[PDB]
Amino acid sequence: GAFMFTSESVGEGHPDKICDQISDAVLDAHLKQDPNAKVACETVCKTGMVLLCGEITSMAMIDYQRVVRDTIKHIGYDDSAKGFDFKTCNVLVALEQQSPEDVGAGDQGLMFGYATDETEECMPLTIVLAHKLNTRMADLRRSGVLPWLRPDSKTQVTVQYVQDNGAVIPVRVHTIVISVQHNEDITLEAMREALKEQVIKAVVPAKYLDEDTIYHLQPSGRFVIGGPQGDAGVTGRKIIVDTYGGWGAHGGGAFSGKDYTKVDRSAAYAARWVAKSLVKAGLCRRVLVQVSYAIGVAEPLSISIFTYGTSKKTERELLEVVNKNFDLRPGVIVRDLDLKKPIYQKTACYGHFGRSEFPWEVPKKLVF
Amino acid sequence: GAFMFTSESVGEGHPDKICDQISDAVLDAHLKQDPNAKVACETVCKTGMVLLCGEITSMAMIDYQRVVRDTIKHIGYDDSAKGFDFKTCNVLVALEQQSPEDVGAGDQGLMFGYATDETEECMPLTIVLAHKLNTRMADLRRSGVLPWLRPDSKTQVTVQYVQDNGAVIPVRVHTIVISVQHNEDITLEAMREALKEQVIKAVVPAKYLDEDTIYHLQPSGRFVIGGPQGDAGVTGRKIIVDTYGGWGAHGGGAFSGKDYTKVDRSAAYAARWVAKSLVKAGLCRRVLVQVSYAIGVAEPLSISIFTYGTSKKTERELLEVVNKNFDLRPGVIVRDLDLKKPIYQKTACYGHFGRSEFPWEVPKKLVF
Amino acid sequence: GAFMFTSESVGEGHPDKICDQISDAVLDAHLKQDPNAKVACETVCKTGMVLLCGEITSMAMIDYQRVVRDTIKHIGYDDSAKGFDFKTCNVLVALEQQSPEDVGAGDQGLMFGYATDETEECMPLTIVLAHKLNTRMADLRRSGVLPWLRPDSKTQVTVQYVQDNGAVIPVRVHTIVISVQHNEDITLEAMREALKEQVIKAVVPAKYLDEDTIYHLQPSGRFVIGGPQGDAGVTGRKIIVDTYGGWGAHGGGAFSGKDYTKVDRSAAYAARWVAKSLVKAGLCRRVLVQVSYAIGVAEPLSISIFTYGTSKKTERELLEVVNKNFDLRPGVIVRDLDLKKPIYQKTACYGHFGRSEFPWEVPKKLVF
Amino acid sequence: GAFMFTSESVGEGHPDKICDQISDAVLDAHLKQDPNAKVACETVCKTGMVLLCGEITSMAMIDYQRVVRDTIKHIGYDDSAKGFDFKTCNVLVALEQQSPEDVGAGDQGLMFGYATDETEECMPLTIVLAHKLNTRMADLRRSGVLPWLRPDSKTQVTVQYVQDNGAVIPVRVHTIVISVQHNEDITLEAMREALKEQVIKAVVPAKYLDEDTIYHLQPSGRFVIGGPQGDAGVTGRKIIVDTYGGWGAHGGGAFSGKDYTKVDRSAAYAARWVAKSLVKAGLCRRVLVQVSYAIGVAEPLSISIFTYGTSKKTERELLEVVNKNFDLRPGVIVRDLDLKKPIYQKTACYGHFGRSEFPWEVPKKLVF
Ligand SMILES: CO/C=C\[C@H](N)C(=O)O
Ligand SMILES: CO/C=C\[C@H](N)C(=O)O
Ligand SMILES: [K+]
Ligand SMILES: [K+]
Ligand SMILES: [K+]
Ligand SMILES: [K+]
Ligand SMILES: [K+]
Ligand SMILES: [K+]
Ligand SMILES: [Mg+2]
Ligand SMILES: [Mg+2]
Ligand SMILES: [Mg+2]
Ligand SMILES: [Mg+2]
C-alpha cells in the first residue's frame, strides 16, 4: 500500500534542544537532592545569552550558574567561534525558588502512546534513523574521529513504505538530508564524504541504502559560526522530534522542564510503555494507545487501543489485557517507572522514545 | 465503536499566543508594503517584556515599536494589573532587517492535511468547540457584555464519540474545562454562572449538552493578575491548537513568523484545502491527505490520501481526482491561495483551520 | 564676595538610586553573614525589569530574589501604576558567586574630602537642603501625611552666597525646584501647595526663605506613572549627589556595589572624616583634604590639606595635626570606621556625607 | 607649594566608553538628517549584549542595528575572543522614536568651566597625558605597529606639582599606570617594554620623565579576553574622565546621548570655551568659570569667574570682559559653537575638553 514518510531530529546544539537540555538539567539537579522537588522551568537562549525562567518549589541548594554552564560545556560549547562558550555567555537567572499512589490527575488530559514493529526499538524507522544519525555525529565529535564537527545539526530521513494486511513496512531510505555546524578548516567536499561514509553508512542498514537513495549533505553550503542564535532558542518547541517524528498522535504537551507530577510527561511515558509492551508481547504489530484523564480523578478516564487491524486478539480483548497488566494512575506510574530519578537531561535530546535505557522502554511482561 | 477525545485552545492573551500574534503582525506589516518581503521572526515575552527576534529581508519601512504595541493593545492589554500595558511594556527589538510558479520546495518536507464531516467547518468537534468557546469570551469581553473578562484564557473540550462503518461521529460533550483571566470585582460564583449560560450554552449545540456533561469553570479558583507571564511566552509552541487539536498528523513545523515561502506554512494550508475539498465534494467523510516534498523539486514528491474506509471512490482513484484538480507546487500554492496577503495575524489565534474567511478553507470545485 | 551655587539630589525611586540601593542591599546581605565577603556588583533597571550583575566572592547563602524585591518594596513600589511592583517585576540575576592592618592600597588613587562650617552637618547648605527636601517627602509618604506622594523625586536648591576673609557664607535660598512622582487623584494645585508648606517650609530655615525666593514645584506639570524606567536606571551614575553636590573635588569613583576593600569607598569616607574633624576642632572653617595612594603601598602616598585661607594654623602645621591623629592606611580605615558593618544601603540614597549616623561623620577628637 | 595629583582616562573599548560612544553615534546619525532631532538615549552593554534605550523625537530614517554595529566595529571589536564582535553580538533596541536665539534654559543648572596654562591645550597635565596615552595605543593598534593591542585600556597619570604666586606648575610625572587588553601570543615582558618605549616615551615630554618615575604596566598581569564586560557597561558613568580629570568642579551631568538642547552639554562646553579664551588672552593663568541658569530664563542667572589670584585684571573686571565678549544664552551657544553638527561620537572618548578640533576649544578673540 505504498506511501512515503519523512521525519527529522536535531542535535544537542540546536538552540531549542539546548534549552530543553538546560531545563532538564535543572530538573535533574533538584531531584538528586529532593526527589519531591516541584520543578516548572524553561530556558530561552540567543547567542551567548541564556535566560532561565520558572517556578520551582524545592529544598535543595543549587548553583544554577553551575548547572547551566556545565550543560553548555557538555553540549560542546567551549570555544568562542562556535557560537557559545559556557565560560563567557550570559546566564541570566530569573527563577523563583520556594521551600516546602492514588493521587489524582492534574488537568483534564489525553495522552497518546505509539509502537510499531518495523524496528527493534519499536519506533518508526524514519525517526529512529534521524535520531541515530545525530547521535553518531556526536560520537565522532566526542571521540575525535571527526574533529571539525560542531554541536548544532539537523537531520531528515525520508523512507518509502508499503502496508501489509495490518500495517507499515519500510522498504528503502529514499532521501537523507543532513546539515551540521563545523570548524572553518574543512572543505565542503571533505564534510560531505565523511557524512556519507562515516555517519550515514555507519548507522543505516544496508537493506535500506540504494544506488538511488538521495543525499543532501550540508545543502546550504557552510554552517560555521551558526552556533545557537537560530533567532532565539526555546524550551518546548521540538515536540515532534521528542516523540514519534510525526507518527502517532500528539496532543501538544511539551516534556522538558516539567517534573514527574505533570501528566503531560509521566502519562505520555506510561502510554509509550504499554504500546511497546503490546507489540513486544506479540499482541499486535502496530499500536496507537490513547489514555484519557479527568481533572481530579486518579484512575484513567478511558483508555482506547487502536491496532491497525494488526492484532489477532481484537480491541476490547486487548483492552482487558491492558487493564489486567497496567495501573496507569499517575502515582503508580511515577512509582513503577522510577520517575523521581534524575534521568531527564538524557531524555532532552535524541528523542524520549526508542532508547532502552529508560524505564518506559523496558516492555512489561503482560500475562494476557 | 466508542472512544473519547479531548482538545484544547487558548485565548489571545495566553503568552505563547501573544507571541504568535506579534510575529504575524510583523509579517502583515511587511506584506502590506512589499508582498515579497522575506520574513523569519519570532517573539518572546515575559510580563511587560517583549523581545522581537529575527532576520527579515524586506523593503518596507516599519515601526516595530508600533506594530508590537498595537498588537498588545488589540489583544486587550491596556491597563496595568492585567499583566500587560502596551503603553508601558518593554519592547526590545533585536530584529535584523536587510533590503533586496515552478520555484521549488525549500527543505525536504512532509505536510499533513485533515478534514472530517462531523461539523460544517470540516473540523473535529472537539477543537472547533474549544476555539469557539475562546472566541466567544473575546466577543463578550469586547462588546462589554462580560466586562470582567480579561484576555488570557484556556479551554478544553472532551467529547464522547462512536465510529460509523467508515469514521467518527460525536455523541456528546462529556466535559468542558475553562479558565479565563479576570478583574478583581467579580465573584467566582458569578464568573462560573456566566461561563455556563453566556459562553458554553451560547456556542455548544443543544444536541451535545447533557444533564451529565461536566463543567470545570475556573477550577484553580482565581486568575486575576494572571495575564501573560506563564513564566514565559514563545512563538511556535502551540502547534497542536493551531491545527487539529491532536487529530490528524503533525510533523512539527510552526507557522507564525514564517512568510509564505516556507513549505511549513503554505503547503500545510494547501493540504488542508484538498482535505476540505474532498469531503465537501462528497468523495469521503474523513480524510488525512499527506503531501511530501523534496528539497529542490517544485512538484510534490508523493501525495498520499487516507480515507478511513469512508470513500466510495478508493484511494488511487481519489489520488487522480487530486492530481487532476490541484497543482500543489509551492509557487502555484501561494498564487492560488493569495498567500502574499496580510491575513496572518488573524491566523495566529483561534486556529489556522476551520474559519472560512481564509483562502485554504474555501473548498475547490473538484471536477472528479 | 558674592556668587551663587546650585545642588541637586534624588529620591529613593529615581531609577539610578534604585540601582545604587539594590547593589548596596546585596552588599549588606553578605556582610551580615560574612564580614569578609568580597562584593563587586551593580544593578540595571528599566520598568519592572531589574538586572543584577557582578562578581562576589563570599560564603553566605543569599536569596537575591528576596534582597532585590525587599529593596523595591522598601522604596515603596508595591502597586502597578507606580512604575514598579516588587511582587511582579522581572529580577534577572546574572551574578556569579564563588566561595573562599597594613594591607596595602589596591589601584593608584586620589581621594578627596570636604567640610565647611555653613551648616551643623559640615556640608554645603545647597546639597544639605536638596537632600533634606527629598528625605522629608519620603517621611510624609511613609507616615501617611501626603499619601499621593510616590517614590521618584528630584530636587534642586540654589543658594546665594558671599565669601568672608576665608570662605563661604550662605545668605538666602534663591530658588528651589522640586518634582515628585504622584498618584492620579491629586491636583497640580494641591501638590504645589503641600510642597511649599509641608516640605520646603518644614525643612528650610526661616533665615533663608524670602518674599523673592523662587519656587518651581512640579514644573513639567504631571509625573504619575513616571515610575523608574527613566530610560534605564544604573548604578554609579549619581556620583555628585552621593557626595558634595558639586562642591569639593571628585575623582570619579562610584560607591555603591563596592565592598569596604575598595579605596574608592573607604578612603573617600576617611577623607570626609578628617575634613569634618578639622573644621569641628576649630582648625579651619572650610577644608578640602586630598589623600593619595600608591598601588601596593599601605601608607598614603601624600595627603594635602587645602583650607581656603580659613585656618590660623597653616597648611603643614595642619598636616602634622592630621599625621598625629589619623592612620589612613586602608586596613586601619576599615577597622576604625567599622566598615564591615552592613550600613551600606542607608548610604545609597540621600547622600553619603552629612548624616551623623555614619562612622565617618563622627568627628575625631584631634589632640592637635 | 608642592602637592601631587592623579588623573585617569579609559580607552575606546572600556565598556562605559563603549556605551558613551554608541549613544553619541546614534545622536550623530540623527543630526545628519535632522539637525533639530531631539535625542535622549543611553546604551547598556554586557559581553556581546548591547541594549539601546531612549526617547528620540526626530524625522530621519535610521538603522540602529547599523549604527550600533558600525560603532563596535570602529572601536575594534570584530573577532570573537576580544570580548565582542559587531557581527555576532546581540543588539536589542528598545528605543522609542516619534516624529514632529532667546530660547530659555531647561532645568535650573550650574555649569563649570576650567582652563590652566600648564599645557598648550589649556588642560591639567595629568588628564592630558592620561588621554594621550590611550590615544597613542589606539594609533599603534590601528596602524599595525602594536598588533597585539586590543581596544580596552585604562590609564592613570600622577604628576608632582608646585604652586606659583598664582597657580599650578607640573614638575614631573611621579608614576604612570597602564593596563591594556591584548591578544594571547604576546609576553608580559614584551608588552611592558612596548608600553614604555613606544607609548609612554613617545607622548610624555622629556622634561617630565625621570630616573625615578614609576611605571605600572599591566600590573594585574594579563587582560586578554578581558574586553568590555566589566560585569557591565553604561552611559554617563565616566563623567570625570570626560572633563577635567578631577580638576575643576563638576555638578554631575553626563554628556553622551543628550542633544544640544540640554544645558548639561551645551553650557558646559560654553563655560570651557570662555575659560580657555581667558587664559589664552593672557587675562589669567588658571580659571574656574561658573555659569548658572534658571529654569525658563534664557540669559545666564549669574556667571562667576574664579582666577586663583592669577589674573592682573581682578574678578569683576574680568566679569565685564566676559559679558562684553560672550552671549551664553543657550540658543546663541548652539549657534556659535555649531552644536547641530554630528561631532558627538568623537567627543565620546578621550575627553570632551582639550582637543582643538571642537568648536568650544577654539579660543574667542576677546576684545577686553
Ligand atoms: C490560576 O490560573 C492560571 C493560568 C492558566 N492556566 C493559563 O495561564 O492559561
Ligand atoms: C585584569 O585587567 C582587567 C580590567 C581593566 N582594569 C579594565 O577593564 O579597565
Ligand atoms: K515548556
Ligand atoms: K512546538
Ligand atoms: K518558530
Ligand atoms: K558601579
Ligand atoms: K556619573
Ligand atoms: K545619561
Ligand atoms: Mg488547573
Ligand atoms: Mg497563562
Ligand atoms: Mg589593578
Ligand atoms: Mg574593562
CSV table of N, CA and C in Angstrom, one decimal, chain C residues 148 178-196 216-224:
chain,number,residue,atom,x,y,z
C,148,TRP,N,-0.4,60.9,48.4
C,148,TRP,CA,-0.3,60.9,47.0
C,148,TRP,C,1.1,60.9,46.5
C,178,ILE,N,11.4,71.4,42.7
C,178,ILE,CA,11.1,70.0,43.1
C,178,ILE,C,10.0,69.4,42.2
C,179,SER,N,10.3,68.2,41.8
C,179,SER,CA,9.4,67.4,41.1
C,179,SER,C,9.3,66.1,41.8
C,180,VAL,N,8.1,65.6,42.0
C,180,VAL,CA,7.9,64.3,42.7
C,180,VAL,C,6.8,63.5,42.0
C,181,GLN,N,7.0,62.2,41.9
C,181,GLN,CA,6.0,61.3,41.2
C,181,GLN,C,4.8,61.4,42.1
C,182,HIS,N,3.6,61.1,41.5
C,182,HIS,CA,2.4,61.1,42.3
C,182,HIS,C,1.2,60.3,41.8
C,183,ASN,N,0.2,60.1,42.7
C,183,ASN,CA,-1.0,59.4,42.3
C,183,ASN,C,-1.9,60.3,41.5
C,184,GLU,N,-2.8,59.7,40.7
C,184,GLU,CA,-3.7,60.5,39.8
C,184,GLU,C,-4.7,61.4,40.5
C,185,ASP,N,-5.3,61.0,41.6
C,185,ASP,CA,-6.3,61.8,42.3
C,185,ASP,C,-5.7,62.9,43.2
C,186,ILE,N,-5.0,63.8,42.6
C,186,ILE,CA,-4.5,64.9,43.4
C,186,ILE,C,-4.2,66.0,42.4
C,187,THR,N,-4.7,67.2,42.6
C,187,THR,CA,-4.5,68.3,41.7
C,187,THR,C,-3.1,68.9,41.7
C,188,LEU,N,-2.7,69.5,40.6
C,188,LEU,CA,-1.4,70.1,40.5
C,188,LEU,C,-1.4,71.3,41.5
C,189,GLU,N,-2.5,71.9,41.7
C,189,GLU,CA,-2.6,73.0,42.6
C,189,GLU,C,-2.4,72.5,44.1
C,190,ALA,N,-3.0,71.4,44.4
C,190,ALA,CA,-2.8,70.9,45.8
C,190,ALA,C,-1.4,70.3,46.0
C,191,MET,N,-0.8,69.8,45.0
C,191,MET,CA,0.6,69.3,45.2
C,191,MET,C,1.5,70.4,45.5
C,192,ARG,N,1.4,71.5,44.6
C,192,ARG,CA,2.3,72.6,44.8
C,192,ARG,C,2.2,73.3,46.1
C,193,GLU,N,1.0,73.3,46.7
C,193,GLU,CA,0.8,74.0,47.9
C,193,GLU,C,1.4,73.1,49.1
C,194,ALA,N,1.2,71.8,49.0
C,194,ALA,CA,1.8,70.9,50.0
C,194,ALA,C,3.3,70.9,50.0
C,195,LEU,N,3.9,71.1,48.8
C,195,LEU,CA,5.3,71.1,48.6
C,195,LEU,C,6.0,72.3,49.2
C,196,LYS,N,5.2,73.4,49.2
C,196,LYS,CA,5.8,74.7,49.8
C,196,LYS,C,5.6,74.8,51.3
C,216,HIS,N,9.8,76.3,42.0
C,216,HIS,CA,9.4,75.6,40.8
C,216,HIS,C,9.0,74.2,41.2
C,217,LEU,N,7.7,74.1,41.6
C,217,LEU,CA,7.2,72.8,42.1
C,217,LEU,C,6.4,72.1,41.0
C,218,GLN,N,6.8,70.9,40.6
C,218,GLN,CA,6.2,70.1,39.6
C,218,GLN,C,6.2,71.0,38.3
C,219,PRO,N,7.3,71.5,37.9
C,219,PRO,CA,7.4,72.4,36.7
C,219,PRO,C,6.8,71.8,35.4
C,220,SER,N,7.1,70.6,35.2
C,220,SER,CA,6.7,69.9,34.0
C,220,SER,C,5.2,69.4,34.1
C,221,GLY,N,4.4,69.9,35.0
C,221,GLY,CA,3.1,69.5,35.2
C,221,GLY,C,3.0,68.2,35.9
C,222,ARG,N,2.4,67.1,35.3
C,222,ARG,CA,2.3,65.8,36.0
C,222,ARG,C,3.3,64.7,35.7
C,223,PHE,N,3.6,63.9,36.8
C,223,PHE,CA,4.6,62.9,36.8
C,223,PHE,C,3.9,61.7,37.6
C,224,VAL,N,3.1,61.0,36.9
C,224,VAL,CA,2.3,59.9,37.7
C,224,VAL,C,3.0,58.6,37.5
